[PDB]
Write a protein that binds this DNA or RNA. Structure first.
Length: 49
RNA sequence: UUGGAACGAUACAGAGAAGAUUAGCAUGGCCCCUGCGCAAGGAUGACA
Protein backbone atom coordinates (compact mmCIF):
# COMPACT_ATOMS: atom_id res chain seq x y z
CA UNK A 1 0.00 0.00 0.00
CA UNK A 2 1.26 3.47 -0.87
CA UNK A 3 0.78 4.69 2.70
CA UNK A 4 2.96 1.83 3.95
CA UNK A 5 5.69 2.71 1.44
CA UNK A 6 5.45 6.35 2.47
CA UNK A 7 5.89 5.45 6.13
CA UNK A 8 8.83 3.19 5.27
CA UNK A 9 10.51 5.93 3.22
CA UNK A 10 9.94 8.49 5.97
CA UNK A 11 11.53 6.16 8.52
CA UNK A 12 14.44 5.34 6.19
CA UNK A 13 15.07 9.01 5.44
CA UNK A 14 15.01 9.75 9.16
CA UNK A 15 17.55 6.96 9.68
CA UNK A 16 19.78 8.29 6.90
CA UNK A 17 19.64 11.87 8.20
CA UNK A 18 20.33 10.58 11.72
CA UNK A 19 23.38 8.74 10.37
CA UNK A 20 24.53 11.94 8.68
CA UNK A 21 24.01 13.97 11.87
CA UNK A 22 26.14 11.66 14.03
CA UNK A 23 28.87 11.64 11.39
CA UNK A 24 31.79 12.77 13.58
CA UNK A 25 30.39 11.11 16.74
CA UNK A 26 28.79 14.39 17.84
CA UNK A 27 25.61 13.78 19.84
CA UNK A 28 24.57 17.38 20.62
CA UNK A 29 22.35 17.72 17.54
CA UNK A 30 18.97 15.97 17.61
CA UNK A 31 16.70 15.40 14.62
CA UNK A 32 13.06 14.93 15.58
CA UNK A 33 10.51 12.92 13.59
CA UNK A 34 9.17 16.10 11.97
CA UNK A 35 12.71 16.64 10.59
CA UNK A 36 13.57 19.68 12.70
CA UNK A 37 17.22 19.89 13.73
CA UNK A 38 17.81 21.30 17.21
CA UNK A 39 20.59 21.16 19.80
CA UNK A 40 19.96 18.87 22.77
CA UNK A 41 21.33 21.57 25.09
CA UNK A 42 22.86 25.04 25.08
CA UNK A 43 25.82 24.06 22.91
CA UNK A 44 29.11 25.91 23.23
CA UNK A 45 30.48 28.03 20.40
CA UNK A 46 33.17 25.51 19.47
CA UNK A 47 30.54 22.77 19.37
CA UNK A 48 28.26 25.04 17.34
CA UNK A 49 31.06 25.45 14.80
C1' U B 1 34.18 -4.21 39.48
C1' U B 2 34.08 -2.82 34.11
C1' G B 3 32.89 0.28 30.00
C1' G B 4 31.33 5.87 27.19
C1' A B 5 34.07 10.07 25.82
C1' A B 6 39.26 11.46 25.27
C1' C B 7 39.45 17.77 18.54
C1' G B 8 35.69 16.14 25.09
C1' A B 9 35.42 17.31 29.93
C1' U B 10 36.87 19.57 34.24
C1' A B 11 41.14 22.19 37.68
C1' C B 12 44.32 26.41 37.62
C1' A B 13 45.08 30.83 35.28
C1' G B 14 43.16 34.37 32.02
C1' A B 15 46.24 41.94 29.81
C1' G B 16 43.66 37.62 24.00
C1' A B 17 47.24 45.10 25.31
C1' A B 18 51.91 46.64 23.42
C1' G B 19 56.78 46.04 23.09
C1' A B 20 64.32 44.01 21.86
C1' U B 21 62.15 49.35 26.92
C1' U B 22 66.43 53.66 29.27
C1' A B 23 69.39 56.61 32.05
C1' G B 24 74.99 57.88 32.68
C1' C B 25 79.83 58.06 30.76
C1' A B 26 83.47 56.93 27.41
C1' U B 27 84.85 55.90 22.53
C1' G B 28 84.33 57.24 17.00
C1' G B 29 83.46 61.55 13.23
C1' C B 30 84.25 66.97 12.49
C1' C B 31 86.16 72.04 13.56
C1' C B 32 89.01 74.73 16.70
C1' C B 33 92.04 75.79 21.07
C1' U B 34 96.03 74.62 24.58
C1' G B 35 100.46 71.99 26.19
C1' C B 36 104.62 68.67 25.20
C1' G B 37 107.42 65.52 22.09
C1' C B 38 109.46 64.37 16.76
C1' A B 39 111.22 65.64 11.95
C1' A B 40 112.68 69.57 9.27
C1' G B 41 112.29 74.80 7.80
C1' G B 42 111.52 80.43 8.00
C1' A B 43 112.24 85.59 9.55
C1' U B 44 114.96 88.61 12.97
C1' G B 45 117.82 91.12 17.30
C1' A B 46 123.11 91.61 19.39
C1' C B 47 129.62 95.89 20.78
C1' A B 48 135.31 95.20 22.18
Amino acid sequence: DWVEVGLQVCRQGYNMLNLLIHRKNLNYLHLDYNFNLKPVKTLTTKERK
